[PDB]
Amino acid sequence: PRIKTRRSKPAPDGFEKIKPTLTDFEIQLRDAQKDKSSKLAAKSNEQLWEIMQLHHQRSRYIYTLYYKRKAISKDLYDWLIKEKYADKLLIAKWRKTGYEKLCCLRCIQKNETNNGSTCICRVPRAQLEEEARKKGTQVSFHQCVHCGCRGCASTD
RNA sequence: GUUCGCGAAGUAACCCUUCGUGGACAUUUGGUCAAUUUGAAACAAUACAGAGAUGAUCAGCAGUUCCCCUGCAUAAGGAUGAACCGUUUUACAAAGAGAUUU
Ligand SMILES: [K+]
Ligand SMILES: [K+]
Ligand SMILES: [K+]
Ligand SMILES: [Zn+2]
Ligand SMILES: [Zn+2]
Ligand SMILES: [Zn+2]
């Protein structure tokens, strides 16, 4: 979230009920962002994957509060969005059929992949398994490179 | 996951609720690249020596080169940037004379 300044309106009614959870997310992100001297490239990437996961989880929590549980008012939701507590573009994808579990927006940026495809993590696990067993090899896909997503198709 | 349709249970019957089941939506990331000795950076350090044309001290500007360095550079600078300094035999014939040989 963005720093509090004269531009910031007071947190709407109900913020204090959710604030402890948002503070735990903040603490986790505050530690993940640190420099940890990871020697290996693989571990280095996995440390950015933790940040992408935490960002997703915080937005997912707020999304569940507003759209699924109706536990917060629209004024609070709009404030959380304005204050960058939740990613509105990612929540916008979660509201669309077939994207209800999208890990991140980067995994659907077709323009940035070599083949113009989405990230492999969008493919339903059943289709990868069928292709692999037909081919006679195990499923080689484990975690995608942009974020450590292991599969985010709505069916999985 | 969502949603459209169907079976079913719950309810007096709808709404609603769950179990089952068909369709729709969403569909292949990344690497020319592994993490200290063995696939390659260099300066420096110790020693000696102390810059071409000079009897002596020097300004230089070039050229040739499968040597380049600094610089944005087609400028300029780098000892006149450096190297240059050695080694060198046959398109080999003609005319004539005096000695050698059968
Ligand atoms: K001298
Ligand atoms: K000179
Ligand atoms: K010069
Ligand atoms: Zn994903
Ligand atoms: Zn992703
Ligand atoms: Zn992905």
Swiss-Prot record:
GO cellular component: nucleus; Prp19 complex; spliceosomal complex; U2 snRNP
Keywords: mRNA processing, mRNA splicing, Nucleus
InterPro entries: BUD31, BUD31/G10-rel_CS
An example Gene Ontology biological process: cellular bud site selection
Pfam families per UniProt: BUD31 (PF01125)
Domain of life (superkingdom): Eukaryota
Span(s) of short sequence motif Nuclear localization signal: 1-10
Record's keyword annotation contains Nucleus: yes
Subcellular locations according to the entry: Nucleus
Misc. comment: Present with 1900 molecules/cell in log phase SD medium.
Subunit (UniProt): Belongs to the CWC complex (or CEF1-associated complex), a spliceosome sub-complex reminiscent of a late-stage spliceosome composed of the U2, U5 and U6 snRNAs and at least BUD13, BUD31, BRR2, CDC40, CEF1, CLF1, CUS1, CWC2, CWC15, CWC21, CWC22, CWC23, CWC24, CWC25, CWC27, ECM2, HSH155, IST3, ISY1, LEA1, MSL1, NTC20, PRP8, PRP9, PRP11, PRP19, PRP21, PRP22, PRP45, PRP46, SLU7, SMB1, SMD1, SMD2, SMD3, SMX2, SMX3, SNT309, SNU114, SPP2, SYF1, SYF2, RSE1 and YJU2.
Family recorded in the similarity comment: Belongs to the BUD31 (G10) family.
Role played: Involved in pre-mRNA splicing. Important for bud site selection.
Protein's name in the database: Pre-mRNA-splicing factor BUD31
Originating species: Saccharomyces cerevisiae (strain ATCC 204508 / S288c)
